[PDB]
Structures are given as structure tokens and as C-alpha cells.
């Protein structure tokens, strides 16, 4: 009795979703757009990438792709695509991101130019601001900081700004993952770094000759990403 009732319930729900989502198609710009021209998504699932071709791009399979490097490179990717593919624009972006994240371990710490010019905090609290009340609600000691910062600092060399600037925006956002080599997602490059570090420390104690280098495996993975798009 139950199986019969369930088929009607599910079939109506598919028709409703199908009637609404039917015109959402990936476009040459890589955006999922409706027939109106409306942009539902700017990359298909937050990163391009078709659910079918992403099965072996999962950490737990670089072990398999490494073992079959020669067929995977020869039969599908080709050594040529590596020859026609250049990564400088995307590689420099990831270096900038890495440097930023190196200077800011806690990325929820309220970066700011003026906030960065609170290291004199002790300089002010020692003796300077000891005499006032809450003039306009701020503080007796906050007004000294405001005065010292405001116009008693260099004209164009008061560059506490650079020590407090935003993280570079993700590469897929700026560098067009399709026509730009090495422009991958921020979660894939982390996996590739982890695996390269755990794979260069396995070749050392391997008793089998490996004719693959960490920086050919990296290009292999980057091509296999760029092609699953």
C-alpha cells in the first residue's frame, strides 16, 4: 500500500523542481545562468567542476593517479598540454595569498590601519591621557590616540595600511579557471600541497624507482583539474 502512495508524492515534487530549474545552463563565461540572463551562480558548484569528473580528484586517489601517471598523462592529458599551459599569473596569486595568511594566522582579528596604530597603547596609558573625562563619550585616553594619529603623522608615509590590508581574492574569482593554467580552488591546492609533502617523504624510503618528480605530479593534478570543468 505504501509503495503506491510514495510514487505519486515524489513524481509531483520532481515536476515542480524540473519546471523551475530546467533553464539553468552553464555558459561560456562558466556561470550557471537562467534563460532570462539572470546569474544564479558564477561558477557551477562554487568551483566549476562536473560531479562526474571529480571522483578521482579526491585526496585518496592521488595515490592511484600517481601509480598510473604514464597512462593518465599519455592516454588522456598528454605531455603536450603541459607544454601549451603556463601558470605564472595564478602561481603568483597563490604566493601572495600564502604570504598574507602567513602574516595573519588568525583571520578574524579585526585588521585596520588605525587599529594597527594601537601599539603605543602602553605609551598612552602610561602618563599621557591620565587627565580627562569622556569628552564625547569615547574616553580620556582614546582622544590622545586620535590626536596623535589624525594629523600628527606623516602625510603619505603613515603606511600602517599595508600591514592591515585584505587577503587577495580567490584565484577562480580573478583568473578564469578555464583559460588560465594553475588557477584552481583554494581547497584543492591545499590538498595538493599536503600530498606533495607526504609523497616526497615516501619516495625517500621507497625501494621502487619512481621516475616522477613532485613538480610533474603537480602539473598533472593541475591539468586534471583544469579539464574537469
Amino acid at each position: 500500500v505504501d509503495t503506491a502512495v510514495k510514487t505519486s508524492r515524489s513524481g509531483y515534487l520532481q515536476r515542480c523542481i524540473i519546471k523551475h530549474l530546467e533553464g539553468l545552463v552553464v555558459q561560456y563565461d562558466l556561470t550557471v545562468r537562467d534563460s532570462d540572463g539572470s546569474v544564479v551562480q558564477f561558477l557551477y558548484g562554487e568551483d566549476g567542476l562536473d560531479i562526474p569528473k571529480t571522483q578521482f580528484l579526491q585526496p585518496k586517489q592521488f595515490p592511484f593517479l600517481a601509480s598510473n601517471y604514464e597512462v593518465i598523462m599519455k592516454s588522456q592529458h598528454l605531455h603536450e598540454v603541459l607544454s601549451r599551459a603556463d601558470p605564472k599569473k595564478a602561481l603568483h596569486h597563490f604566493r601572495a595569498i600564502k604570504k598574507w595568511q602567513s602574516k595573519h594566522p588568525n583571520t578574524l582579528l579585526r585588521r585596520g590601519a588605525f587599529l594597527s596604530y594601537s601599539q603605543k597603547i602602553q605609551e598612552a596609558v602610561k602618563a599621557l591621557k591620565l587627565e580627562s573625562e569622556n569628552r564625547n563619550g569615547r574616553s580620556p585616553g582614546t582622544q590622545e590616540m586620535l590626536r596623535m594619529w589624525y594629523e600628527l603623522d606623516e602625510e603619505s608615509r603613515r603606511k600602517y595600511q599595508k600591514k592591515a590590508a585584505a587577503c587577495p581574492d580567490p584565484s577562480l574569482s580573478v583568473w578564469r579557471p578555464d583559460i588560465y593554467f594553475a588557477s584552481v580552488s583554494e581547497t584543492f591546492e591545499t590538498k595538493v600541497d599536503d600530498y606533495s609533502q607526504e609523497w616526497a617523504a615516501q619516495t625517500e624510503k621507497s625501494y621502487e624507482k619512481s621516475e616522477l618528480s613532485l613538480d610533474r605530479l603537480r602539473t598533472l593534478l593541475q591539468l586534471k583539474w583544469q579539464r574537469s570543468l
Partner: protein, 76 residues
């Protein structure tokens, strides 16, 4: 000039279909067929040799288009 350089699978399908419908309508085959009666096999033979004078006109969602040559397109 900004879209992908490769030939999507939908483009390959439509180009093969159109070249086959042309061959079947008595069009000259520039591929030196070797005894095959299928126009789709001939169209694949032509696509592999890079002899298809068709212009894929990729349309962007605002009406703007880009004209690519079937020769200047990386067939996987």
C-alpha cells in the same frame, strides 16, 4: 578571444552532425574516404584531419558573440 580554446563536446557533436548532413547532401569530401558508407564516420575522419571550414559562433548571454574556427580549436 576570452572563451576556452578547446572544443566542448556539444560543439563536437553539432559540428559532426552538420558536416555529416552536408556530406550526405553530395558535398565534396576533403578526407580521402576509404570505402565507408557512413557520413558520420567520414565527418569524424575529417575532424581528425583538421579539415572542416566551419565557424563556431559562441554566443554570450548578452548577445555578444565570438567567432572561432573549427581548425583553431583544440579537439580533445
Amino acid at each position: 578571444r576570452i572563451t576556452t580554446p578547446y572544443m566542448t563536446k556539444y560543439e563536437r557533436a553539432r559540428v559532426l552532425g552538420t558536416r555529416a548532413l552536408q556530406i550526405a547532401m553530395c558535398a565534396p569530401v576533403m578526407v580521402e574516404l576509404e570505402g565507408e558508407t557512413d557520413p558520420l564516420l567520414i565527418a569524424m575522419k575529417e575532424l581528425k584531419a583538421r579539415k572542416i571550414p566551419i565557424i563556431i559562433r559562441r554566443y554570450l548571454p548578452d548577445g555578444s558573440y565570438e567567432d572561432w574556427g573549427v581548425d583553431e580549436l583544440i579537439i580533445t
